[PDB]
Amino acid sequence: GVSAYLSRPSPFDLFIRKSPTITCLVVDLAPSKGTVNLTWSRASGKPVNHSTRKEEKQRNGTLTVTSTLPVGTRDWIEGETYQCRVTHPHLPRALMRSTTKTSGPRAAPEVYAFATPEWPGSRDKRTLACLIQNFMPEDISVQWLHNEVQLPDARHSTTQPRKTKGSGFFVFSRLEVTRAEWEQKDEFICRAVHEAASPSQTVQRAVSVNP
Amino acid sequence: GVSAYLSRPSPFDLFIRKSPTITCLVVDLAPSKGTVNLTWSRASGKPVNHSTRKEEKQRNGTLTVTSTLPVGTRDWIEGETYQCRVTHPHLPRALMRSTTKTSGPRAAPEVYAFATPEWPGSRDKRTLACLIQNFMPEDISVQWLHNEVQLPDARHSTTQPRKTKGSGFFVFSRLEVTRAEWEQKDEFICRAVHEAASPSQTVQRAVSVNP
Amino acid sequence: DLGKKLLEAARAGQDDEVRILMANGADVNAIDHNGTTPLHLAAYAGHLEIVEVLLKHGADVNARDLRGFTPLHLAAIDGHLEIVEVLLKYGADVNADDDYGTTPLHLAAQYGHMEIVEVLLKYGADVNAQDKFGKTAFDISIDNGNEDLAEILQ
Amino acid sequence: GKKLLEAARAGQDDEVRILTANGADVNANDYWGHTPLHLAAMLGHLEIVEVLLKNGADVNATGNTGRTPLHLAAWADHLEIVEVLLKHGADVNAQDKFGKTAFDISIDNGNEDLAEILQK
Amino acid sequence: DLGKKLLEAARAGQDDEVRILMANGADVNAIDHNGTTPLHLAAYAGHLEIVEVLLKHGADVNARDLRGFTPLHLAAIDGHLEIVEVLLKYGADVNADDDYGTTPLHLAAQYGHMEIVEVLLKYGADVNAQDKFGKTAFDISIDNGNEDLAEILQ
Amino acid sequence: GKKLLEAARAGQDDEVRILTANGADVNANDYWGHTPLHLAAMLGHLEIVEVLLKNGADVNATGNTGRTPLHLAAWADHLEIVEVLLKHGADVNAQDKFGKTAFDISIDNGNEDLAEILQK
Numbered sequence A, B: 001g002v003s004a005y006l007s008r009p010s011p012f013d014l015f016i017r018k019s020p021t022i023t024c025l026v027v028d029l030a031p032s033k034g035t036v037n038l039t040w041s042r043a044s045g046k047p048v049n050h051s052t053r054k055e056e057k058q059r060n061g062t063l064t065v066t067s068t069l070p071v072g073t074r075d076w077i078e079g080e081t082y083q084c085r086v087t088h089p090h091l092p093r094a095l096m097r098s099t100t101k102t103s104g105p106r107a108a109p110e111v112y113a114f115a116t117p118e119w120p121g122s123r124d125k126r127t128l129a130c131l132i133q134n135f136m137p138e139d140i141s142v143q144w145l146h147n148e149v150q151l152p153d154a155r156h157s158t159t160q161p162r163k164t165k166g167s168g169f170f171v172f173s174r175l176e177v178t179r180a181e182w183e184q185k186d187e188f189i190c191r192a193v194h195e196a197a198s199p200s201q202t203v204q205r206a207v208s209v210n211p
Numbered sequence C, E: 001d002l003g004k005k006l007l008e009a010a011r012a013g014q015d016d017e018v019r020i021l022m023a024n025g026a027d028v029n030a031i032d033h034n035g036t037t038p039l040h041l042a043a044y045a046g047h048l049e050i051v052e053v054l055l056k057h058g059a060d061v062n063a064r065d066l067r068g069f070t071p072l073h074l075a076a077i078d079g080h081l082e083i084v085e086v087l088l089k090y091g092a093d094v095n096a097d098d099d100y101g102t103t104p105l106h107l108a109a110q111y112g113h114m115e116i117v118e119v120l121l122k123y124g125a126d127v128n129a130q131d132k133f134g135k136t137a138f139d140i141s142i143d144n145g146n147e148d149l150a151e152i153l154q
Numbered sequence D, F: 001g002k003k004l005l006e007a008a009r010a011g012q013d014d015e016v017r018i019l020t021a022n023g024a025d026v027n028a029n030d031y032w033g034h035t036p037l038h039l040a041a042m043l044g045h046l047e048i049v050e051v052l053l054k055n056g057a058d059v060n061a062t063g064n065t066g067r068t069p070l071h072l073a074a075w076a077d078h079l080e081i082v083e084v085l086l087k088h089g090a091d092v093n094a095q096d097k098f099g100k101t102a103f104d105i106s107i108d109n110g111n112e113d114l115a116e117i118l119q120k
């Protein structure tokens, strides 16, 4: 009952933070006293950096162990492959997960943003929506911005990338805003970080609550 | 690689078609010799109607088997629990899946529809988006309508129901429309079928490509 | 406005409040966001005595919500036999269709209300009425398991 | 008074407890004449079945169909709830309208592990 | 219009087509949906000759797109040394910051362009400038494995 | 001429075939000096390794780190590809800058089931 996952860097970490990382997440549903070990290796054999390891036992009694390995921006876009080999004493066979740069057609995102009308009960709250469509590959980062201030990721929910009925991928983003926020400044910006958006890897769109 | 799934009746089938059904889906990644059997039974022991079975072998080699059972409306809304058992000669145990009416707080959906601006290339096509939010429980059916015609489901894409941290679930629907269509009539309607939309279990919003 | 509380009054069943609000000028055909009228809500909730008050005072008996529901549809769903009669005596379209071709006979068959289907039949309900999915009210009762009802669905 | 029926289905653990302090009927019947004990046994909510047991619900309560909490727990393959209801005392030979016992259900559904708990 | 064709011509390297479009009155500082000027694209794509021509026609050397990139940012990313020098000679801001705090020195360190780094430092680049995540170009080079470049950055 | 590299990495088989027929170099090299064959073996695309073999791809091509296509196939724990590559005359005793064979790589990864193939 052990699972392991390896992710590509987020476009935000790679282009905005300029510090890409990959994370090996291991989720043990029923943990024994043995300690999980996560080892890193590159396909070329060139040396891995020093990873960071995190450990948390959740309320349902499961253990989540993560290892975050810094990668090189050069090595990632030039196609290096990284593997994470997981060994635990009570696991009969090792689990290995790999990751590498995305492949296939490359399309820049299209961004549109909307604002819901004033519901009588929602006098002091409004819902803003963002449509990000027709991009490839599927990896993308979504951000909400107000008064030149990044809003926390917890304030909006972004759907998982889905293949369009036509061409590309599309995500949606839902964000609630308060009357105090739009009265201070009635301008909210939805920003997408995506590799295929040239030249700056960002596309954005603004929306106002008041017409 | 054998998995089984058992769904509740779609709100569309139960409230609109007036013919609620439950479907048992089995996907076998490596089909070995032997017949898959799917059997139904009710918790009260009352008889079940006659079901329909469908089989289909995809390109990758996998077998997909389905059994759809008609259920009664009064039956379902009064809390009858149904159970699907999947048997194959080369499976160690049998597989069992169960389904019953939704539970918990009940809240009617809010529906908002939006239209994307015209783009130089996409002058003959354009994208409509629908936000259905703050609904409980999580089962929802989404439909787009134009000129008293229900558009085929293959023309739109609807996101999985996602929970706003505090108040209800939300879905999004993306529909591409053609210039031929909005020139015939610039009224496109996004309708939701949901239990708690009282008294008719439908909530809707209209959108126009041009004001 | 006053129309809001009339809608809320008719749904809750507050008979005297409906009369008080109507006397004060409330619109007997006020609608909410789905086109629902107080006659719809009173027929759905089963308040015969508000149904009659609204009908005598100019409430549209064949009003349709955004789905195409007339009050008779909702009365057949919630199985309110006397409301079905009074609605029909006041000129309710017994063969009214919603956007999907659903007639009151379809819904009464779905929820197994034999007493309602024969009142509808008495008032000329079309046994052959087909929803846009191609199913008569006979088919709906068969698929919902009311074979005892499908016998009289001709 | 029948808000405990909806809560037993929903699995609201502590809701059930406050609903019994106010003395919601532990033998309230749904459309299928089944008590909140049936429903919690059917849907696998074990803490709940115990508080209904502590508050004095009939372990051998019968629905319209003659089915006890044991029947519904066997049908749903919730092995522990069967043991608990047995420990608190249930008629294993109780039949239903169609002539079946919890053991007959276990044979029809093919749970030998359940059948072994029942015949011992 | 002319701005769209000039942006495409400036990106593709279409040398004579930039001149014809500007002869037709194309705005040398035309912008697209994300604020990108033709100078941005010419600097990004490495077209030094078009970069020079655009500057000679009054192109804003410090133009910023919606992220806050100047053409110097882009020339630093792709490592076009001669374009960085011409941008600086025409008055580019070496310490230009984006909406996240990223200077050209940050981008040169991320992509390991040592000789870009030397020139930017010769023109007064703040080695101590932090992005809004609290990191200097020294930090960025270390996080990217360019430890040989980190010795020049402290 | 290096669209074959991305086509080998992406794994679109028919896309590879048509590029190879037009004469695209089967010994094209990425930033690390690896052919389309390296990427196909590493990414577990057996179907393409054979098409490349038909086109005569060097099975012992050395990357900039001195790794053969066999090295990466063992690194990725791809059993059948390794024996295919070995059948086409792979050099087992080749070593990288580190000084490692595919065997050493299965020893580091603890893949003795594949180390048997290399032992065998």
Ligand SMILES: *[C@@H]1O[C@H](CO)[C@@H](O[C@@H]2O[C@H](CO)[C@@H](O[C@@H]3O[C@H](CO)[C@@H](O)[C@H](O)[C@@H]3O)[C@H](O)[C@H]2NC(C)=O)[C@H](O)[C@H]1NC(C)=O
Binding pocket: A005, A025, A027, A028, A029, A058, A060, A062, A063, A064
């Ligand atoms: C309680 O038990 C559930 C088992 O149902 C466990 O939830 C599991 O949580 C992990 C993350 O801790 C999920 O894995 C990964 O989630 C990330 C989210 O960013 C995603 O990137 C990965 O692709 C992967 O999905 C896993 O999906 C989830 N499992 C299920 C069935 O939901 C966990 O032990 C406990 N739950 C929580 C919320 O802690």
Ligand SMILES: *[C@@H]1O[C@H](CO)[C@@H](O[C@@H]2O[C@H](CO)[C@@H](O[C@@H]3O[C@H](CO)[C@@H](O)[C@H](O)[C@@H]3O)[C@H](O)[C@H]2NC(C)=O)[C@H](O)[C@H]1NC(C)=O
Binding pocket: B005, B025, B027, B028, B029, B058, B059, B060, B061, B062
């Ligand atoms: C290749 O074989 C796979 C068999 O797995 C076929 O895909 C499978 O299709 C079924 C039906 O949609 C999927 O069921 C769905 O599963 C999700 C969870 O994964 C569940 O939430 C949904 O309710 C639904 O039951 C099944 O998972 C899916 N497997 C996947 C992920 O591939 C596939 O169609 C075949 N491809 C072709 C066209 O050859």
Ligand SMILES: *[C@@H]1O[C@H](CO[C@@H]2O[C@@H](C)[C@@H](O)[C@@H](O)[C@@H]2O)[C@@H](O[C@@H]2O[C@H](CO)[C@@H](O)[C@H](O)[C@H]2NC(C)=O)[C@H](O)[C@H]1NC(C)=O
Binding pocket: B035, B037, B038, B039, B087, D108, D109
């Ligand atoms: C598939 O199973 C059905 C159901 O029979 C039950 O299924 C078992 C898995 C188990 O639950 C037992 O209680 C039953 O045996 C079979 O339908 C039966 O078919 C026979 C002859 O056709 C008939 O006499 C029974 O009355 C049927 N029972 C029902 C409920 O319809 C069916 O034959 C099985 N098919 C295959 C290919 O095995």
